[PDB]
Amino acid sequence: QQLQKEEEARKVKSGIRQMRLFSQDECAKIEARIDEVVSRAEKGLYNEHTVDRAPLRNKYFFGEGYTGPGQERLYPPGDVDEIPEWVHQLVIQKLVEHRVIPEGFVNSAVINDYQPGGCIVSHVDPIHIFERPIVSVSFFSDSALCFGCKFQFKPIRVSEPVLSLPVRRGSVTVLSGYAADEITHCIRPQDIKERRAVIILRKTRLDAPRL
Ligand SMILES: O=C(O)CNC(=O)C(=O)O
Ligand SMILES: [Mn+2]
């Protein structure tokens, strides 16, 4: 049981790469742009499916977005707004330059914006929708990304995740293999003490089922 948790954590770690790529100034500039997105959404300037509002977490879908169990679908072409130029210029370019992902890979950029006490429940990034690797960049504050999220449903039987990964402002997280496909991830509400935002950069699959 203890050996099993250590083996799983080793497997999770084999599919995680992390690096501090964005300076405090670079973060400040990107954070200003994220604020612009929030403002534009509030002004009703985005397409219908670009904005997903939920109690303590908003999602903003660019390039491609998605919606019983395990049957998410891509919205028809042109339903979501295009990836903003600043995302290419300030975020994707930096990633390509540092050999994190190849040029042309990213066709989907999602911004998650969290209130204090916000969270995201146990999930796997839909395997029928997105290629791997999955890249994420964190912005306003530091937090943690948990892996193996049974604890969110069975706190008596299991109190802790398999692994908790610190995700600092300006850090890039790359998920692949076991970490992206074989285990769930989540964020605990106690780990978001102040506003936090994340830009998730992915490539959708050719055969991603569409509406
Ligand atoms: O906010 C984060 O760091 C993680 N968010 C997600 O896992 C997601 O939107 O798929
Ligand atoms: Mn996810």
CB 118 within 8 Å of CB 56: yes
Technique that determined the structure: X-ray
Question: Does the CB atom of residue 120 touch ligand 1 within 6 A?
Answer: yes
Check whether 125 is labelled as a binding-site residue: yes
Active site residue: 46, 60, 66, 75, which one? 66
| Dihedral angle sign, alpha carbons of residues 72, 40, 195, 93 | positive
Q: Which two structure tokens, joined as six digits, stand for 89? A: 């210029």
CB 204 within 8 Å of CB 73: no
| Dihedral angle sign, alpha carbons of residues 168, 197, 180, 135 | negative
| Dihedral angle sign, alpha carbons of residues 33, 166, 195, 108 | positive
Question: Does the CB atom of residue 112 touch ligand 1 within 6 A?
Answer: yes
Question: Does the CB atom of residue 199 touch ligand 1 within 6 A?
Answer: no
Q: Whose CA is nearest to atom 3 of ligand 1?
A: 198
Check whether 10 is labelled as a binding-site residue: no
Set out the domains of the chain in order of their start, with CATH numbers.
Answer: 1-211 (2.60.120.590)
Tell me how far the alpha carbon of residue 123 lies from the centroid of ligand 1, in angstroms: 9
Q: How far is it, in rounded angstroms, from Cα 41 to Cα 176?
A: 31
